[PDB]
Amino acid sequence: MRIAVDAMGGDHAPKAVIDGVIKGIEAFDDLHITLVGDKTTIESHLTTTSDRITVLHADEVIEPTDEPVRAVRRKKNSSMVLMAQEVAENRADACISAGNTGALMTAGLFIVGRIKGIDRPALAPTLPTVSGDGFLLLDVGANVDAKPEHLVQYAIMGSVYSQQVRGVTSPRVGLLNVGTEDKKGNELTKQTFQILKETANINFIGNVEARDLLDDVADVVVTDGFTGNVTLKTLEGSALSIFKMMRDVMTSTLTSKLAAAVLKPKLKEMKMKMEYSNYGGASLFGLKAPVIKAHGSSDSNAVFHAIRQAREMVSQNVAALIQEEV
Amino acid sequence: MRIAVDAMGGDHAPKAVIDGVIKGIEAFDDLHITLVGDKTTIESHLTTTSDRITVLHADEVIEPTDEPVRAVRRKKNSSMVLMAQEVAENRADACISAGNTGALMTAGLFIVGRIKGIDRPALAPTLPTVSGDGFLLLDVGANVDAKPEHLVQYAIMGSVYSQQVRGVTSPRVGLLNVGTEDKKGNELTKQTFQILKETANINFIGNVEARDLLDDVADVVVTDGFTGNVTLKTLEGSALSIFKMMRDVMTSTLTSKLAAAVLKPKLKEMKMKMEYSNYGGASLFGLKAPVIKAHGSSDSNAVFHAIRQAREMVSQNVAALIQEE
C-alpha cells in the first residue's frame, strides 16, 4: 500500500505533515508514503525516521489565492499536481493534501478521474455527534448544482464508506431536509427522496432535520453541495460562538476564583467540537482512488488520522465496491 | 393596540400562552389581547381579571398533524382561523400563534392576505449576534422553492423592517452564499446576486458566509426558504448539541463541584441562547398585517417576546411601509 502526501499544503506545513507521516509509518508496517514537495526541506525533518518514505521533489507550490483550474493546469510541478499524478500513474493507491480545497478537487477530477458510472464527485467530511459516533455529511461544496441522481450516488458511496471504513453494518442514510415528513423539501430534495425510497442497496431512513444533525440522527446525511457547504459553515460558526460564551463563563471575574480548577477543561472543550480531524478528514468520493482533503489547520495527529482513514479506504477496496454498487 | 393570540396551538398551550399573554398585559399598558380558543379551558387558566383580555370561543383546533389547506378551509371555527379572521375584519392589528406552521402560513395567505406587489411572503426571525445588534434571517421556510425575484423582495422587506423597527439607518443586506466572489453559489444564488447588485432600494454588501452570521456580517441576510430553514435549524439544534457536549467535559467530583458554582451563569447562558427569547417568533413579511409564528415549544417567556415584537411591528407601520416600497 502506497499513499502520496502533499508535504507543502496546510497552515503548519511542512513540519506537521512530515511529523504525521512519521507517526503513520511507525504505526502501520505495510504502509509506504511518497512525500511530495521541496525535497531538501522535507529531508531536513526526516533525520530520525526514513524507512518506508520516498521523497519526490516538486519545484513549485499552489498558493491559496490562486484559481484552482489555472493553477492545476499551469503548475505541472506543484506538490499537489505531482501528488495526484502518482495516483494516476499507479505509483500510489491514495493521496492526501492539507492544501487548497478547490485545487485538490480540480486535481482529483482532472488527474485521478472518476469511478466508472459516477457522474459527480462529492466532498464528504465526518462530523462529530454527542455520542461520539460521528456521521458523514456529503456534499459540502464539491458540486454546487446537483441532480437527484447525483445525490443517490452520494448516498450509495457514503453507505459503502460507513460500512467498510467506519464498520457500521447497516448505515442509516438520511436526506437533509426541512422536516421529518416524507414529502418535504424543494424540487431536488423531493425527487431525490422518491428515488432513495426505491434504492435497494441502502438503509434509507428518510428525511432528517438539520436541528438533529449532531444528535446521532443518521450515519450518512445526504445533501447537495451548496446546502451542505452552508450547513458545514453554519456548524463551524455555531461552534465558535458557543466556545466563546463558555470561555467567558469559565474565565469571568464574577465567578469564584477557586473555580480556576476549570481553566484546564477549556482546551478539552475546544477539542470536542472544533477539531473533528480525529475522524480523518474530508474524502473526495467518486474518484478512481481515495483522495483526502486534510483540514488546513491539521497538526501531526490530524495528518496521522487522515493516513489511517486512507489506509482503510484502500485495504477495504472502497472504490471498487462503489463501482459495483452503481 | 389589539393583538389576537391563538390560545390552543403549541406544545405547552394553553397554559404557557395564557401566562405569556398575562405577562404582556402586565408589561404594556396599551396592549389589548383577544385570546382565541375554548372558553371554558381558557377560563380555567385565567388567574387575572383584566378588562384588556377578551376570550373568543373556538369550537375546534387545528392539530399538528392536520393538512394546512384542508384544515384551514374545513375548520372555519378553529382557534387559528378565528384568530386570523379577527385581523382580516379589523378587530385586531396583529396575531400570534404557536400552532402548526404550515396551517398558520396558509391562514395568513388565505385570510389576512398579501400586500399588493408581494408574490410570496417570507418567514423572518431576528437572531442574536455577538455584538447584541442582532440580524434578520429570511426566508426560513415559508416557500421552499424560490425565484431570484422573490429573494429581491425579501431583501426589500427585511431592509424596511431593519430600518423602521430595528433602527438601523442603512441596513446592510447580504446574500447567504458559499463564497465572497461574485460567481459563487448555485444557479438561484448567483442569479439573485446579480439582481440584488442592480436593486435600487437596498444597501447590498454582497455575499456573506454562514460561518460569520453570529458576528454581525450583515443586518439582513437573504436566502431561499429551503436553505434558510436548514441554516436556522442548524443554528438552534447545534447550539443545544454543542452546549451539551461542552458541559459533559465537567463530570468528575471536583469538576462537578466547580461546574455547580457556575450553574447560575450557565442557566443564564442557556436562556440567552434560546432564539425564542432574543426575539419573538418568525414574522411573516408580506402580509397585510403582522402574523407571528411563535416557536412550537414556546413557554410563557417566548410568547411574551412574540407579543412585544408584534407590538413594535404594529406601532411602526411596517405593513404600510413595505407596501410603499
Residue numbers in the entry:
A (entry chain A): 1 to 326
B (entry chain B): 1 to 325
Original paper wording:
The phosphate acyltransferase PlsX is one of the few proteins known to localize to RIFs in B. subtilis, which are present in a punctate pattern and stained with a high specificity with the lipid analog indocarbocyanine dye DiIC12. PlsX is an obvious peripheral membrane protein because it was over-expressed and purified as a cytosol protein10 and yet was consistently observed to associate with the membrane.
B. subtilis PlsX was crystallized in the presence of the product analog palmitoyl phosphoramide and the crystal structure was determined at 2.30 Å resolution. However, the product analog was not found in the solved structure, in which the asymmetric unit contains two largely symmetric subunits in a mushroom architecture with a four-helix bundle stem formed at the dimeric interface. The structure is closely similar to the previously solved structure of the same protein with a root-mean-squared deviation of 0.56 Å over all comparable Cα carbon atoms, forming two symmetric large cavities suspected to be the active sites at the dimeric interface (circled in Fig. 1a). The 13-residue fragment is structurally different in the two subunits of the dimeric structure. By mutating the interfacial residues of the amphipathic peptide and determining their effects on the subcellular localization, we showed that this α-peptide is indeed responsible for the RIFs localization through direct interaction with the membrane.
